Amino acid sequence: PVNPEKLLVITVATAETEGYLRFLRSAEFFNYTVRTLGLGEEWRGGDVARTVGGGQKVRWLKKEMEKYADREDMIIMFVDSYDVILAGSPTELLKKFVQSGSRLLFSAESFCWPEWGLAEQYPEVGTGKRFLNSGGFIGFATTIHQIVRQWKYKDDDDDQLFYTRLYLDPGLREKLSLNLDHKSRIFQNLNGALDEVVLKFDRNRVRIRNVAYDTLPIVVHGNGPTKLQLNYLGNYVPNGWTPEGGCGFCNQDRQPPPRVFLAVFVEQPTPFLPRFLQRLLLLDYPPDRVTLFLHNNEVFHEPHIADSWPQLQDHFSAVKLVGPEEALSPGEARDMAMDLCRQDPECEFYFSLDADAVLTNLQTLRILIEENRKVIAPMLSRHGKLWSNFWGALSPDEYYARSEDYVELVQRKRVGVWNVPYISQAYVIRGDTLRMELPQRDVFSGSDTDPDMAFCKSFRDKGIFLHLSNQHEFGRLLATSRYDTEHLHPDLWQIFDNPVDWKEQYIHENYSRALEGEGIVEQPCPDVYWFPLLSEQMCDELVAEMEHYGQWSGGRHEDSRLAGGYENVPTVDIHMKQVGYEDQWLQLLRTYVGPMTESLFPGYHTKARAVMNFVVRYRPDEQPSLRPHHDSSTFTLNVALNHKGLDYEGGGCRFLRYDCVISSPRKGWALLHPGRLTHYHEGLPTTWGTRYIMVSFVDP
Amino acid sequence: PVNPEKLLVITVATAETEGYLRFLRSAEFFNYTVRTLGLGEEWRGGDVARTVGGGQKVRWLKKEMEKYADREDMIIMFVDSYDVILAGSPTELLKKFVQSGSRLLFSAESFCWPEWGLAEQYPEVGTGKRFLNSGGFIGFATTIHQIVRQWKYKDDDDDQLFYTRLYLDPGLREKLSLNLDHKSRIFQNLNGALDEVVLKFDRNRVRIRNVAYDTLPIVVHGNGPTKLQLNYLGNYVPNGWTPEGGCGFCNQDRQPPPRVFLAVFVEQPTPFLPRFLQRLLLLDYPPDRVTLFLHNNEVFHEPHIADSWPQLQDHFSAVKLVGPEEALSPGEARDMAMDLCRQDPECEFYFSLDADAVLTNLQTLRILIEENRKVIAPMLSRHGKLWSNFWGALSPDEYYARSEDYVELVQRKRVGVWNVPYISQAYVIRGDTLRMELPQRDVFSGSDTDPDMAFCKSFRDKGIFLHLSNQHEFGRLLATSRYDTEHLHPDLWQIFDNPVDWKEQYIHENYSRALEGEGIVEQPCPDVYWFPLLSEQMCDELVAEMEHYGQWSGGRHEDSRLAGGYENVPTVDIHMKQVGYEDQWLQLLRTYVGPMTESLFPGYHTKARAVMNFVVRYRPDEQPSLRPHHDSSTFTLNVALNHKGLDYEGGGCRFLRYDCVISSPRKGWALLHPGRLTHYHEGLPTTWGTRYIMVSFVDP
Numbered sequence A, B: 001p002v003n004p005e006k007l008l009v010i011t012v013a014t015a016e017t018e019g020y021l022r023f024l025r026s027a028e029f030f031n032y033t034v035r036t037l038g039l040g041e042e043w044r045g046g047d048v049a050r051t052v053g054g055g056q057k058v059r060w061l062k063k064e065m066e067k068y069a070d071r072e073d074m075i076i077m078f079v080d081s082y083d084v085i086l087a088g089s090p091t092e093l094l095k096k097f098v099q100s101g102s103r104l105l106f107s108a109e110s111f112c113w114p115e116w117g118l119a120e121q122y123p124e125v126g127t128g129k130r131f132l133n134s135g136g137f138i139g140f141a142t143t144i145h146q147i148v149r150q151w152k153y154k155d156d157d158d159d160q161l162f163y164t165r166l167y168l169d170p171g172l173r174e175k176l177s178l179n180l181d182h183k184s185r186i187f188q189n190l191n192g193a194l195d196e197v198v199l200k201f202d203r204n205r206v207r208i209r210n211v212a213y214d215t216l217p218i219v220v221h222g223n224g225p226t227k228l229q230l231n232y233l234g235n236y237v238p239n240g241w242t243p244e245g246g247c248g249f250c251n252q253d254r255q256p257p258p259r260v261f262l263a264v265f266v267e268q269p270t271p272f273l274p275r276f277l278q279r280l281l282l283l284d285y286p287p288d289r290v291t292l293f294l295h296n297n298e299v300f301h302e303p304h305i306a307d308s309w310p311q312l313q314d315h316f317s318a319v320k321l322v323g324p325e326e327a328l329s330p331g332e333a334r335d336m337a338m339d340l341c342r343q344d345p346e347c348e349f350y351f352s353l354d355a356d357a358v359l360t361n362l363q364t365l366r367i368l369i370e371e372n373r374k375v376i377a378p379m380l381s382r383h384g385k386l387w388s389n390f391w392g393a394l395s396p397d398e399y400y401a402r403s404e405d406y407v408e409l410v411q412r413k414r415v416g417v418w419n420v421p422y423i424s425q426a427y428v429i430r431g432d433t434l435r436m437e438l439p440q441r442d443v444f445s446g447s448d449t450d451p452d453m454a455f456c457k458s459f460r461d462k463g464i465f466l467h468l469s470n471q472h473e474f475g476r477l478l479a480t481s482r483y484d485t486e487h488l489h490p491d492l493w494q495i496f497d498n499p500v501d502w503k504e505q506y507i508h509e510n511y512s513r514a515l516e517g518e519g520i521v522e523q524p525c526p527d528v529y530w531f532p533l534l535s536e537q538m539c540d541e542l543v544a545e546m547e548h549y550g551q552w553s554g555g556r557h558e559d560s561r562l563a564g565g566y567e568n569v570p571t572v573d574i575h576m577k578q579v580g581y582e583d584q585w586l587q588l589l590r591t592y593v594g595p596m597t598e599s600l601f602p603g604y605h606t607k608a609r610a611v612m613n614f615v616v617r618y619r620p621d622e623q624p625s626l627r628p629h630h631d632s633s634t635f636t637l638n639v640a641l642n643h644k645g646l647d648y649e650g651g652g653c654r655f656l657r658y659d660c661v662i663s664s665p666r667k668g669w670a671l672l673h674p675g676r677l678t679h680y681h682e683g684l685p686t687t688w689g690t691r692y693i694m695v696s697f698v699d700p
């Protein structure tokens, strides 16, 4: 049993990148001892991501090995560090190395690289990997010194070609007992074997298994174009996220804060923007520490921005607006806002927030800053769907692809902080990173590629991790796809596309409490119920939308009201049909009125059918009253729309068989009463002003 | 101006018949002085109604005139008495006689009778009547003596031929100044001139006018086959009935009573016969003075007669039943009952009452006896129509015809006692008249003619008046035309044909009072009303009709009840459709439930539509209860049909939204409640016995 104290891991790293630090964390988890070569130096090995190179690694290793040229008692493992993680213990590693019977065991891979022509010189292997990969090897210190000392080449010559040529010397291969880990017992190279690797979970750690050979590799190498697949594995292996411990590097459970540049982007017509702008004032972060940049590309939103701007200017440390007149593209505007933070050494963090992002968590900015990442996004999801502001995987064309764990993350079955290839709509970036690592201005622009993909590719090309937190509930994404802007108040028509935000804006704030009981719903007249339904904003916008239509009812108009033996009781009204709001109002009936009716009339079941939906206008100048009648409905919904006293002086509704009067209606509240037989009712005259009400004859 | 004291009216009458007495009354009304010849004697003039004769009249007149052979100061008018009425005063008569310039003026007529061949010998008259009629003439006593003294012929030779021959002597006609009243200035003979005669009314007397000649005759003569037309005129002329005095000979405003034979005839299946038999016990006339004869031709009515017979035998002085086993024809039975009174000298009055006659006036028998007529019928009319138990006129074939005043009599615009050609269904006949004037047994029988017409013709042939009183309200006639006898209780199906009697038998006696208000209708639960609807007899017969059908509901039966989201609430029931009682029950809803609903729910209008009408049976053995549900109706009618405690031990109806229970239902009473939304209701379990209810889901 070889002593683990005799094992030394050697790797090369010119900077403490996130990949190098990810490697070190995996090494410390198994109590390895690591020696890092080259931390101070500038990299002369070439563009190794692009082409051959890395000879500088062999030069540094050769110098380091002269210490141990005679140490037959020492086992040394050399691995890359930027794209490698450790998945097993030194004891298991040394056990498998002895089992191999080799004195220097190289990792194996599917491709003969760089010189494909040398594939014939390799020994035949039946089912395993045939060719050498220099990203990982392990052997006696003496044997390794005999190989690396033969290096006398350029810093940008290929390291793998150097090792391949020595391995293909049959006499040297037999002399020094050189071997390749054909079946990935120790080394797993991902390039060319992605379908062979799966995650194997345990209680408090995660490994990988090669299902082609049924092995549990020690070293995971994301060589070549498998960096993102390694990022995926590195979220779990070895202690990134575990079934019983949760994530291993997140904050989990949570004197002046850093100064922040907050950039807001309005690049399309987006619903509920006045609500978004008001929400900026509620973010829980000292506003004197926040600088606001807002780009609006939409002339539709200029009035919305103008209403909010006095409050925003009075709130934040400094504000700046770039409107549609500047004719900035989305990529140009995002480059401008980011470079404003980059060129200001007082900007410690950059917070980009798009208009379709709804932050329900007011501590979002704090939470993300505590995570101490270069780049991190909060997970935001379109309500009740899978689409969200990140991608778990990339297609070979670098377009969208679904990762194996994407649904678990979106549904928050696994929570933590995740290294992902794509983020959008909301993220926090270290200002230091913009200055020192992404100094160029063309982050979002410079090519035909879409700005938000260019942004993510710019960071991936520099080896910067894009982090995503679902550790908390942060918010949601608004649907903006088919936002019909040709209305006086377009957000009235948003009941289908954004029902959660629609409810918060237009449904009475005390509706939900009344639906659950606890003494809000009133019964002012025998079987007449009274409950809050619409918010004042809903009432004002519905009335305004009616007057904007303008074509109120007149003579020869017929409503479905029963008086005596004739249905000849009319009102000056506008039906939802004529303004194209019928489908919308019927959705409100199904969702909010239906369930309220079934609760107040136990035993009755409703699907909220209604062909008669209309707003009535009472005025002394035209039609101030409504004579006694029955409604052609099973029950009737009657919603006030303005204020008694402020907007009109006049009575409400009188139920004659009870001599009961609703004399003071409440603006947001709705009356619910039977329509036939028993509640013969009358609309008392409006004596001054204008009285608006909304009425539906439901279940006729 | 000729003195009225010098005028003597002479007539012939062998008996004081009603026609002779009618003549005398008209004569006394104008203060005429009348001398009647022949009152003691037997008539030897022959069958004057059949053929020629009446020479006995001339013989008596000749003897009488020998007193006045020299009295040139005396004017004498000879007229028949049985078929003559006086319409004008002696002053007007004497004025018109002088105006004629005649010394003996005969009445004129259209027909040359008896010898038609003598028509050539008559003088030509342009437009008036050409021929002599001996039924009336007026002239100086001396001139009349010169003519009548030439009589030397048989008692059964023709009187008119005798006068005609003397008038056709041209020398004698010129000598004695004989003339004919060509234009009916004094005498109106009806035969051949019916279209010329109309009634002329005044305040307190009635005359006739001849519209062909524009005259106001003094003497109205119903000669030949115009006796019935004279009967018609005699109801008015001269003081029979007047616009301001009413009728002139009726009782108008009303110690042992006479003994009466009451005969009841059941000659067809007739509705509500048990009610008729019970009504016999309520007639206001001392029952110890009444003998009962009842002929039933219907085996259908044998059980009805049997139930009533102990009460009738205990009530009246004597009773006798002749049932269907005797196989008597209607004419044979009516002859038998009438001859029973005829052969009993203790029978002072005979009262024939048919089963379709409903006597609402319990004093009918008294009232008619006070009228002191030989024969009199009470006017009885089929409800709301013109058909009644008398004819005002006869066709030439002696079948039905409408008289000019028939509608005024039936509608009681003119009330009184009327001489009519036909009566039926109810009449009172003097026993003396049966013994002395109609002694034969074949009154109703003896010929192919219908029995009730034979009866009337038998009296008309004897000159007996058939009187009819509409001076009071007496009752009505039941419709019996299409009485469907194939039911367990056929009178349940009588709602259309006899609605007044149907209501009194089956509608709750206190229903009408409740419909008018005054604290009968109750509201035991909020909008649930409770009112008496059906009588106990209706409930018992409806239940019995249901069990007689027997085919109650079972598994897979579906009623239109709403529970949760499904219409799967069934009951063990029988619908009115399956027993053929739907149309009948719908008529009850329209007539009685509809108006009750519109009164209790002001503003609601109903036509009482209902497709779901059914009787429910609750039993512990099968289905004792009914789970909570809504009815598929605007409102629901729920009628108990038997007794809580006596027939079943179990709860009634529970309305859950009110925690209100109808624990003790009332047999005849009905519940009225809304069917949808608000009155979720439950049928509490029946724990013992059987519970029957009737329910209609109206206005679905």
Ligand SMILES: *[C@@H]1O[C@H](CO)[C@@H](O[C@@H]2O[C@H](CO)[C@@H](O)[C@H](O)[C@H]2NC(C)=O)[C@H](O)[C@H]1NC(C)=O
Binding pocket: A509, A510
């Ligand atoms: C929703 O309910 C809350 C509490 O029941 C209401 O808050 C009250 O508002 C009135 C005036 O609007 C104040 O006088 C009370 O002091 C408030 N009570 C509390 C506990 O804050 C609120 O008004 C309701 N919302 C609407 C739109 O009516």
Ligand SMILES: *[C@@H]1O[C@H](CO)[C@@H](O[C@@H]2O[C@H](CO)[C@@H](O)[C@H](O)[C@H]2NC(C)=O)[C@H](O)[C@H]1NC(C)=O
Binding pocket: B509, B510
């Ligand atoms: C119809 O109403 C009358 C009077 O309102 C009811 O007569 C009463 O009947 C009860 C027993 O049924 C007696 O105790 C009372 O003394 C009666 N009152 C009078 C004034 O006679 C009659 O019962 C009602 N009819 C039905 C079928 O219930």
Ligand SMILES: O=c1ccn([C@@H]2O[C@H](COP(=O)(O)OP(=O)(O)O)[C@@H](O)[C@H]2O)c(=O)[nH]1
Binding pocket: A011, A012, A013, A014, A015, A038, A043, A045, A048, A049, A054, A057, A080, A081, A082, A083, A135, A222, A223, A224
């Ligand atoms: O700027 C650099 C680039 C490379 N490396 C080291 O050289 C190794 C080879 O780089 P890479 O993993 O990207 O090449 P690949 O394994 O994909 O062939 C890295 O893991 C680092 O340890 C370094 O230290 N600094």
Ligand SMILES: O=c1ccn([C@@H]2O[C@H](COP(=O)(O)OP(=O)(O)O)[C@@H](O)[C@H]2O)c(=O)[nH]1
Binding pocket: B011, B012, B013, B014, B015, B038, B043, B045, B048, B049, B054, B057, B080, B081, B082, B083, B135, B222, B223, B224
């Ligand atoms: O039994 C009779 C029949 C006849 N008359 C008298 O004779 C008249 C002639 O009879 P009738 O009127 O019936 O004959 P008509 O006028 O129709 O020719 C009657 O009016 C009676 O006054 C009579 O006294 N007793």
Ligand SMILES: *[C@@H]1O[C@H](CO)[C@@H](O)[C@H](O)[C@H]1NC(C)=O
Binding pocket: A029, A030, A031
């Ligand atoms: C690593 O070493 C420490 C002592 O420095 C020891 O407490 C710990 O248990 C070791 N962990 C593993 C996984 O070997």
Ligand SMILES: *[C@@H]1O[C@H](CO)[C@@H](O)[C@H](O)[C@H]1NC(C)=O
Binding pocket: B029, B030, B031
């Ligand atoms: C008839 O005579 C009486 C007197 O006997 C007289 O009072 C009455 O007025 C007379 N009536 C007529 C109509 O002449």
Ligand SMILES: O=C(O)CCC(=O)C(=O)O
Binding pocket: A561, A571, A616, A626, A631, A638, A652, A653, A681, A682, A683, A684, A693, A695
């Ligand atoms: O004016 C009111 O409050 C009553 C209106 C009404 O009943 C109707 O629209 O049918």
Ligand SMILES: O=C(O)CCC(=O)C(=O)O
Binding pocket: B561, B571, B616, B626, B631, B638, B652, B653, B681, B682, B683, B684, B693, B695
């Ligand atoms: O049993 C009862 O009284 C209720 C019956 C009922 O509600 C029904 O027939 O629908």
Ligand SMILES: [Fe+2]
Binding pocket: A553, A557, A558, A559, A571, A573, A574, A575, A614
């Ligand atoms: Fe309307």
Ligand SMILES: [Fe+2]
Binding pocket: A561, A629, A630, A631, A636, A681
């Ligand atoms: Fe209404």
Ligand SMILES: [Fe+2]
Binding pocket: B553, B557, B558, B559, B571, B573, B574, B575, B614
């Ligand atoms: Fe049924």
Ligand SMILES: [Fe+2]
Binding pocket: B561, B629, B630, B631, B636, B681
């Ligand atoms: Fe029911």
Ligand SMILES: [Mn+2]
Binding pocket: A080, A081, A083, A084, A135, A221, A222, A223, A224
């Ligand atoms: Mn590598």
Ligand SMILES: [Mn+2]
Binding pocket: B080, B081, B083, B084, B135, B221, B222, B223, B224
């Ligand atoms: Mn006559």
